[PDB]
Amino acid sequence: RQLENLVQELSQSNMMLYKQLEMLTDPSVSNPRNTIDTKDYSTHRLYQ
């Protein structure tokens, strides 16, 4: 049980360090800057 307590604490440490990695590696923007984005439909209307 005494070792299991530290196992729980280390697992808590591992999960709270797991939860920080995915926030810094989010591909929100998905050369994309050179091309006209289809989501940016204002540029599409401008071209049309």
Binding site: L6, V7, L10, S11
Partner: protein
């Protein structure tokens, strides 16, 4: 009367005496089953954590 009561006493002794040797034969076994499957896995598990 003491002899027959002591025969009852001998039965009340042997009911535990016969069980003690059997449970002490397997006394290493169940503790080692707890060792190799529950306690020692937690003994390792701190270090890969």
């Amino acid at each position: 009367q003491l002899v027959e009561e002591t025969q009852e006493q001998v039965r009340l002794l042997i009911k535990g005496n016969s069980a003690s040797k059997t449970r002490l034969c397997r006394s290493p076994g169940e503790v080692l089953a707890l060792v190799q499957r529950k306690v020692v896995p937690t003994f390792e598990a701190v270090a890969p954590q």
